Design a protein around this nucleic acid. Structure first.
Length: 1062
RNA sequence: GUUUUAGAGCUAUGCUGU
RNA sequence: AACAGCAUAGCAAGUUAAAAUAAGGAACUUGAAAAAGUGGCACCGAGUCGGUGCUU
């Protein structure tokens, strides 16, 4: 019908949900297979999937290769031959036959040994007049005389063999060229991916500093001599060092225990990069990928100082100049060494043993070794002017080919192709006809698996992408091959692992330190605060503010933190951002004025001076002070409004764009009479902050530890928000919906007056905050509350979008729904013996002294050295192992984590051949979940005072809710886990500590949820007592149990009963 | 970075041979 | 004499291109495999999902 699917892709889960126009989750029926009679079943459309990482055939069939690029080359040269064949059979004669047979010696040629034309004359003359290829190419470029079709063929083959990369899309231009703008892009990406400890480059002419002709060390040092805040050992210093050709290290910045050396010119680059990334984390995979575009530009600048003409390759001019210089130095050096200092001449030009000059040209000698060897002679030689500096400048006797013929955009090549074709349009009639096609093939650049492998990242995300694609295909096949109207994609942020929770504290500690030493106030001396206390927002802002209120000149008291209030410089009605850059402290928020704009001018005039000594201390940023004094330049403008719109609705991560492109290409396939792509399935991408604030605002709280439902919860919410946005603002689709859409402007979205023009024009909105229509009342910065219509409808078509009374109840029901599927992906592992996978075998064994045989079933563990021999002849294998009369048909392969269930619906998970794991999940009511979260967050409410006090009364009324949650876990434990002594200790301790404060009770109940937690048994702590794990050694009760084959998503289930077999 | 083939080497001396 | 192969003693000089790449001491069905397929529709309820109607 009308429906949608949200997704949330991470390293540990894939969520999925299905909604309708009213935002209801359908509930349907599916068939049951197996051997019992549990025919009736019915499920929801909400679930999640989990898989464990590790080396596996899946992890290998997503690897890196080259043979494929090589065969791409062979098919493209074959295509060249295909194009040339017909017109040569129509122009040349034995042209093609002689060129293929070139390896044969002069007794079986059956033709003439001169492949150029057929005479001995041209042959040597060819390279005599065209020694370096650039001669030939330049000749075609600026020559109007006739040429040989075969020489054009060879030249064209050369340019396509060395074509380049595709790291930049579109035609070349200053936007995607030059140096300074790319440096600006790098610093902007750094300053975006961090919120802390920034770097400001105010109009530094980076091109003149980086493109200057210096050594590989001095060019690094040159910019490092600026940017005071950073050091050469910093991450930025390592980045800039990497993007020139040195060998930096990656140890100290990421605190790793293994040395990491990486170099772009080195062949093994990507393998080291992805190993590093999979070690550290995938959020940082946007800082190295912005230096591979700066090093390319820098090398282009280094090679192309020249550009005498316009219709030439400046690289070609530079290269031919280099060859001429190489010849000239050949002659001079030759003369000097042979004449002036006659000895050692053989040692330099003929020895070839210690890699002299001839050894460097012909032998396996390297440039650095050659320079080291030739240093002493040049040092001790007389008349060495104009030579020594160019030695360590690396510009002596340079080969025309080095490690820099990859860094090379294909636009220069295609432009020279176009120039050559234009020069020779008419002589060959097919050149004009097929110029478009040859351009198309030489610019032209697979399958779903190959595209998934194409993204540069750790294998975890790639596995997640593959599983996402399979989940999408399954979901679209459930609904009768009907395509959706909206599919939101949203990335799952990784929660802090308590390691990065300290590093940010250290960074803000550095901030407060540098401010305190720059200014000189003894705030730290009067009050000692450590990083465990920097986590307090009000305290850290108090230290940021030196201890003085900014709207009124008076010192702030320390121990009256309850009375103070936190405000926003930008009112939340205009923009929703809560970070430190837009949070300040004051006695009361009533000093801002009576307007809704940035604060009044009457305040800034008084404490301008205070704000200068705040800003020059580097403790606040330029953008922060810009928002502080936004009122002096007129106020809010259309450019600023569009800026906030784009910051709130437009993404910056390219990997999300990549996966969105993958799904858009995979699903959207229909076309029209023209060559336009009919985009019937829209793909919408959002940030996490929207859903986070939605939950925080409308009290749909989420807890992660209780069970695995939160992934699917976020999956539902994201699609819910996305459909409302697309249905509310159709014209803003070009901002977040992917595709080549029609651009728009800033004048049509912004009105002139709030109440005098709002709701009186076709224009959408006036307040810059997009998410205001989610709410029912909009609070202003002055205390006035606005009223929104009960039913929200689109003014253009006339269709409703939002129902206040129905949608909230439906969403609350969806969150309170108790039956949500979770599934663990079963896989076979590929690659103190280790068991690859166990087997189930029925056979006859000897029990007693008379060797009397009886048929049994036992769990035998095949080792990793044994699986192939098991495959070849399991009958005699098991006969040698100790079994007799094995049933080949009844032998069933069992991998790790196979689902077994017993009476009363209890489920068990297999861990090894002699141990077991839990296999059931707890379901808890939404009200109890809410109470648990609120009790855990009594001090960390981080909300308005009225909401906070209402919540604490809510907590303190329902003191019995503790009693029936302890009850709830008790009967469930007695039902399933059967750990009697353990329940005995837990309830004894609980009755012991009944009267202790509700807070301290809360997190310890959360800890006690570990017994019901899914996975291997694990120890935990109560208030003061410890509980040790109870391994499930017995493996007999699984013999009469039942096998349930749980699917990839949980939709289809088939159950096999082990009691009937054997 | 690796392996072969084709890019007529010259002058003066001596040697074997067809 | 011409030429091939040798022992000299000196003099003039370098970057392109096809080829090669691994004997290394979830569950089910048809198919070797690439790959094809397998699980009905509405209503009222809601403790791991239940009931009713139509229809395979």
């Amino acid at each position: 019908k009308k429906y949608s699917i949200g997704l949330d892709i991470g390293t540990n889960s894939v969520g999925w949900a299905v909604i309708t126009d009213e935002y209801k989750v359908p509930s349907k029926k599916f068939k049951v297979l197996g051997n019992t009679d549990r025919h009736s079943i019915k499920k929801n459309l909400i679930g999640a999937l989990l898989f464990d990482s590790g080396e596996t055939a899946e992890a290998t069939r997503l690897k890196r290769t080259a043979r494929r690029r090589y065969t791409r080359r062979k098919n493209r040269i074959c295509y060249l031959q295909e194009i040339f064949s017909n017109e040569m059979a129509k122009v040349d004669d034995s042209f093609f036959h002689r060129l293929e047979e070139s390896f044969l010696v002069e007794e079986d040629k059956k033709h003439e040994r001169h492949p150029i034309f057929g005479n001995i004359v041209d042959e040597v003359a060819y390279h005599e007049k065209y020694p370096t290829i650039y001669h030939l190419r330049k000749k075609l470029v600026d020559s109007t005389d006739k040429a040989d079709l075969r020489l054009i063929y060879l030249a064209l083959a050369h340019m396509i063999k060395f074509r380049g990369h595709f790291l930049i899309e579109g035609d070349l231009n200053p936007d995607n060229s030059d140096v300074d703008k790319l440096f600006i892009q790098l610093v902007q990406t750094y300053n975006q991916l961090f919120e802390e400890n920034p770097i400001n480059a105010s109009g530094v002419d980076a091109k003149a500093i980086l493109s200057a002709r210096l050594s590989k060390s001095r060019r690094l040092e040159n910019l490092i001599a600026q940017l005071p805040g950073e050091k050469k050992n910093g991450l930025f210093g390592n980045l800039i060092a990497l993007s020139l050709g040195l060998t930096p290290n990656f140890k100290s910045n990421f605190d790793l225990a293994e040395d990491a050396k990486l170099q772009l010119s080195k062949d093994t680059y990507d393998d080291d990069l992805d190993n590093l990334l999979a070690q550290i984390g995938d959020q940082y995979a946007d800082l190295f990928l912005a230096a591979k575009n700066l090093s390319d530009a820098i090398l282009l600048s280094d090679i192309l100082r020249v550009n005498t003409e316009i219709t030439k390759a400046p690289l070609s001019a530079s290269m031919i100049k280099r060859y001429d210089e190489h010849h000239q130095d050949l002659t001079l050096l030759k003369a000097l060494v042979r004449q002036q200092l006659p000895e050692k001449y053989k040692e330099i030009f003929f020895d070839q043993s210690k890699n002299g000059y001839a050894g460097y040209i012909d032998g396996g000698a390297s440039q650095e070794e050659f320079y080291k060897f030739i240093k002493p002679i040049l040092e001790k030689m007389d008349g060495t002017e104009e030579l020594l500096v160019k030695l360590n400048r690396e510009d002596l006797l340079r080969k025309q080919r080095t490690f820099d013929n990859g860094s090379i955009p294909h636009q220069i090549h295609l432009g020279e192709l176009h120039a050559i074709l234009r020069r020779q349009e008419d002589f060959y009639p097919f050149l004009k006809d097929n110029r478009e096609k040859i351009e198309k093939i030489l610019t032209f650049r697979d399958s779903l698996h190959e595209h998934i492998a194409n993204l540069a990242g750790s294998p975890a995300i790639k596995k997640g992408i593959l599983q996402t694609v399979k989940v999408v295909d399954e979901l679209v096949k459930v609904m009768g091959r009907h395509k959706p109207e909206n599919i939101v994609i949203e990335m799952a942020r990784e929660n802090q692992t308590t390691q990065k929770g300290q590093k940010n504290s250290r960074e803000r500690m550095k901030r407060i330190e540098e401010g305190i030493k720059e200014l000189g106030s003894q705030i730290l001396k009067e009050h000692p605060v450590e990083n465990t206390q920097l986590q307090n927002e009000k305290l850290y802002l108090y230290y940021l503010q030196n201890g003085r209120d900014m709207y009124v000149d008076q010192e702030l008291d320390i121990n009256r933190l309850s009375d103070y209030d936190v405000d926003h410089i930008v009112p939340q009605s205009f923009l929703k951002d809560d970070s430190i850059d837009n949070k300040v402290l004051t006695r009361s928020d009533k000093n801002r004025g009576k307007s809704d704009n940035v604060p009044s001018e009457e305040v800034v005039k008084k404490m301008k001076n205070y704000w200068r000594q705040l800003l020059n201390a580097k403790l606040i940023t330029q953008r922060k002070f810009d928002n502080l004094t936004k009122a002096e330049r007129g106020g809010l403008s259309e450019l600023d409004k569009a800026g906030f719109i784009k910051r709130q609705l437009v993404e910056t991560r390219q990997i999300t764009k990549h996966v969105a492109q993958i799904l858009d290409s995979r699903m959207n396939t229909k076309y029209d009479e023209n060559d336009k792509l009919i985009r019937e399935v829209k793909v919408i991408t959002l940030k996490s902050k929207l859903v986070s604030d939605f939950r925080k605002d409308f009290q749909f709280y989420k807890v992660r530890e209780i069970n695995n439902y939160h992934h699917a919860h976020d999956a539902y919410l994201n699609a819910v928000v996305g459909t409302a946005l697309i249905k509310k603002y159709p014209k803003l689709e070009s901002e977040f919906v992917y595709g080549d859409y029609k651009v728009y402007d800033v004048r049509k979205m912004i009105a002139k007056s709030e109440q005098e023009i709002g709701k009186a024009t076709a224009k959408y909105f006036f307040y810059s905050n997009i998410m205001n229509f989610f709410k029912t009342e909009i609070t202003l910065a002055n205390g006035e509350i606005r009223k929104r219509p009960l039913i929200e409808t689109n003014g253009e078509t006339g269709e409703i979008v939002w129902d206040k009374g129905r949608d909230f109840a439906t969403v609350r029901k969806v969150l309170s729904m108790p039956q949500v599927n979770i599934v663990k992906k079963t896989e076979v592992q590929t690659g103190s013996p280790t068991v690859a996978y166990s087997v189930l075998v029925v056979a006859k064994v000897e029990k007693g002294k008379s060797k009397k045989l009886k048929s049994v079933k036992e769990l035998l563990g095949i080792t990793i050295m044994e699986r192939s021999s098991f495959e070849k002849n399991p009958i005699d294998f098991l006969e040698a192992k100790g079994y007799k009369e094995v049933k080949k048909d009844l032998i069933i392969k069992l991998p790790k984590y196979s689902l077994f269930e017993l009476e009363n619906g209890r489920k068990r998970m297999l861990a090894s051949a002699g141990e077991l794991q839990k296999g059931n999940e707890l379901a808890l009511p939404s009200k109890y979940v809410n109470f648990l979260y609120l009790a855990s967050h009594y001090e960390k409410l981080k909300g308005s005072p009225e909401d906070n006090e209402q919540k604490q009364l809510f907590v303190e009324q329902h003191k019995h809710y503790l009693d029936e949650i302890i009850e709830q876990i008790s009967e469930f434990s007695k039902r399933v886990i059967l750990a009697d002594a353990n329940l005995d200790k837990v309830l004894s301790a609980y009755n012991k500590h009944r009267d202790k404060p509700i807070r301290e009770q809360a997190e310890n109940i959360i800890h006690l949820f570990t017994l019901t937690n899914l996975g291997a048994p694990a120890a935990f702590k109560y208030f003061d007592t410890t509980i040790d794990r109870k391994r499930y050694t017995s493996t007999k009760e699984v013999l009469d149990a039942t096998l349930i084959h749980q699917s990839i998503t949980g939709l289809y289930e088939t159950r096999i009963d082990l009691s009937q077999l054997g």
